[PDB]
Amino acid sequence: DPDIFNRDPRDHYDLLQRLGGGTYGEVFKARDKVSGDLVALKMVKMEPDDDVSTLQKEILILKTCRHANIVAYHGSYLWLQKLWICMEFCGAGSLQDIYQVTGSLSELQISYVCREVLQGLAYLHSQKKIHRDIKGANILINDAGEVRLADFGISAQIGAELARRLEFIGTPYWMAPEVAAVALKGGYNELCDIWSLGITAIELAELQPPLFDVHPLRVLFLMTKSGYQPPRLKEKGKWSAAFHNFIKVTLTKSPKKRPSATKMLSHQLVSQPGLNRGLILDLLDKLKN
Amino acid sequence: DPDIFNRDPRDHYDLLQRLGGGTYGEVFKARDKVSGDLVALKMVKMEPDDDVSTLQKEILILKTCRHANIVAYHGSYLWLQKLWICMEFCGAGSLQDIYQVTGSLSELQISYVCREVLQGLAYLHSQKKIHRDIKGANILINDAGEVRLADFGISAQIGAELARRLEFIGTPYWMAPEVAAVALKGGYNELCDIWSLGITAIELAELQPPLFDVHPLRVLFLMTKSGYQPPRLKEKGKWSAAFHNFIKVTLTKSPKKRPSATKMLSHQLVSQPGLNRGLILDLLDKLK
Ligand SMILES: CC(C)n1cnnc1-c1cccc(N2Cc3c(CN)cccc3C2=O)n1
Ligand SMILES: CC(C)n1cnnc1-c1cccc(N2Cc3c(CN)cccc3C2=O)n1
């Protein structure tokens, strides 16, 4: 990055609190020494021999996003084998931080979250970007009750891993076109984010994703099996027919039939009035008292 | 490997000449100091910090094959950070070593090689193994004109990478079924070997695979294009309708439509009664 700060970020910010980790790195709450503005600073250990392609990709993804529902990027620092990515601070943390205190979200609360995430996903997919890690831990909430997607760590890692395999596949002259296609395009597309959103709506409603108690390797085998049945909401009567249908369509098994983010934004669950940040401000009041 | 010989192979074998390298390692021609039997020894540097996964996978693939069309395995040695894989020596070398001297193979010689490779592929696929690197350089010929598939280096690397990538993929509860499918299955199957054989048949006929002159990166991009046209034999009149048809069906773009190794064994080209080792012994006579 030519815009990188070759300086210690503690010249500009006071580190206030450890916020936890992401796919990689550790996130800090920090305060601008001159303005008093709060930021989130993600510190990643970056040794001299290490491949910097994943972090280069993550900063490129963030830097070229200009949408309210994607965490804002302020800049990055490189100093003493540490790279610091400076981003928008979201005072209430993740939806997982929240629901671990408050309990299950109401259907209206889930609907507002799903609409805001779909707006961010529509934007990302309009740039040929894929989040690939949509879940409650990656959906952040600020003090105003606004929603922001975060942690492009998985997306950047896939992007760097695919580019590293490309320069090392060797002679392709005897390769089958499907092997070359998966080596260049990963074998799936942006609709994987729509499925993840459906699982996330279940997560916000039930405090855990479906099959959370099943071994992760076994969950992968069950999903790859012909005849895999998409998950559903456990309680029938507690949720509206519109919410049950939202889960049904986002959790379409075939990616060829799964609706896009833009198509999902016209679903009645997320296009209803009364969907605004005040619903999350009520959730934040429940967290406090 | 549980059967590894913890001794230096040079105590039992005399190294006679370098046979080049594989996907990794260096292959040597060696002679049994007591019996006089020839073997091929593949040497790979093994550091204590180095991952054993790929070599473990290569040895397991080799050790569990018991088929006439797959290079025989004799054992492995580990001593002073060097791993030595002991295999069947194939006196005439690879088909690439041969055609660089003899020129293009005749249709009958190619038909015979194709049948024999399909037999080894049918065996590999029945064991749930995939070669993934079928080409003239990996099809070996012994002094009897018999055919052996070799170098499971790419197969071992993919298998080890697939298993290594799983742990670094993280939690899967929010993953779409198609992402889980490419994580566990890789996004393709054993029919990739049928295509590679189709390309090999062109390579044996023309001394190069199609698009040999085109930069390797551009070839991959061309192949990924939704409208990529499977290649064909350059000369039309030189080859029978049966051979053109064998190329057409092995190079079926759609993997769901590409015939299996067992289905291909009933194709008119490779089910001809006149196919035998004598065709390659005639090719081998041309060398001496
Ligand atoms: C999702 C997060 C781990 N992350 C991974 N890569 N970038 C980010 C990222 C980017 C911007 C902001 C923030 N956070 C996190 C957070 C927590 C977390 N318990 C708790 C409280 C506030 C915040 C806040 O402002 N995080
Ligand atoms: C395919 C080869 C690179 N290889 C990679 N892993 N295992 C093998 C392997 C395994 C067994 C035998 C042999 N060879 C090679 C060879 C050449 C090569 N110009 C030339 C002459 C004879 C031979 C012979 O017996 N090689």
What chain B holds in terms of domains, given with CATH numbers, is 2-89 (3.30.200.20), 90-288 (1.10.510.10)
Angle between helix A177-185 and helix B216-224 axes, rounded to 10 deg: 100
Give the residue, by CA position, lying nearest to ligand 1 atom 7. A151
Q: Which residues line ligand 1 (CB under 6 A)?
A: A 19-20, 22, 27, 40, 42, 71, 87-90, 93-94, 97, 138, 140, 150-151
To the nearest whole Å, the CA of A238 is away from the closest chain B CA by 23
* Six-digit token string for A214: 């099943």
Ligand nearest to the CA of B149: 2
- CA dihedral in degrees (B279, B281, B286, B287; nearest 10)? 130
Interfacial A residues in 140-169 facing B (CB < 8 Å)? 154, 157, 161, 166, 169
Amino acid at site A275: L
Question: Minimal CA–CA distance to B116: which of B140, B90, B97?
Answer: B140
Catalytic, A193? Answer no
> What's this structure's resolution in Å?
1.7
Per the listing, tokens 């540490």 go with: A82
CB B125 within 8 A of CB B69: no
| A56 C-beta neighbours (distance < 10 Å), count | 15
**What is the distance in A from the centroid of ligand 2 to the CA of A79?**
50
Sheet holding B147-149, edge to edge: B93-94, B139-141, B147-149
User: Where are the extended beta strands (E) located within chain A?
Assistant: 13-21, 26-32, 38-45, 73-79, 82-88, 93-94, 139-141, 147-149
Element holding B204 (H helix, E strand)? helix B192-206
Q: Which residues line ligand 2 (CB under 6 A)?
A: B 19-20, 22, 27, 40, 42, 71, 87-90, 93-94, 97, 138, 140, 150-151
**What length does chain B have?**
288
- Report the residue of chain A nearest B194, measured CA to CA: A176
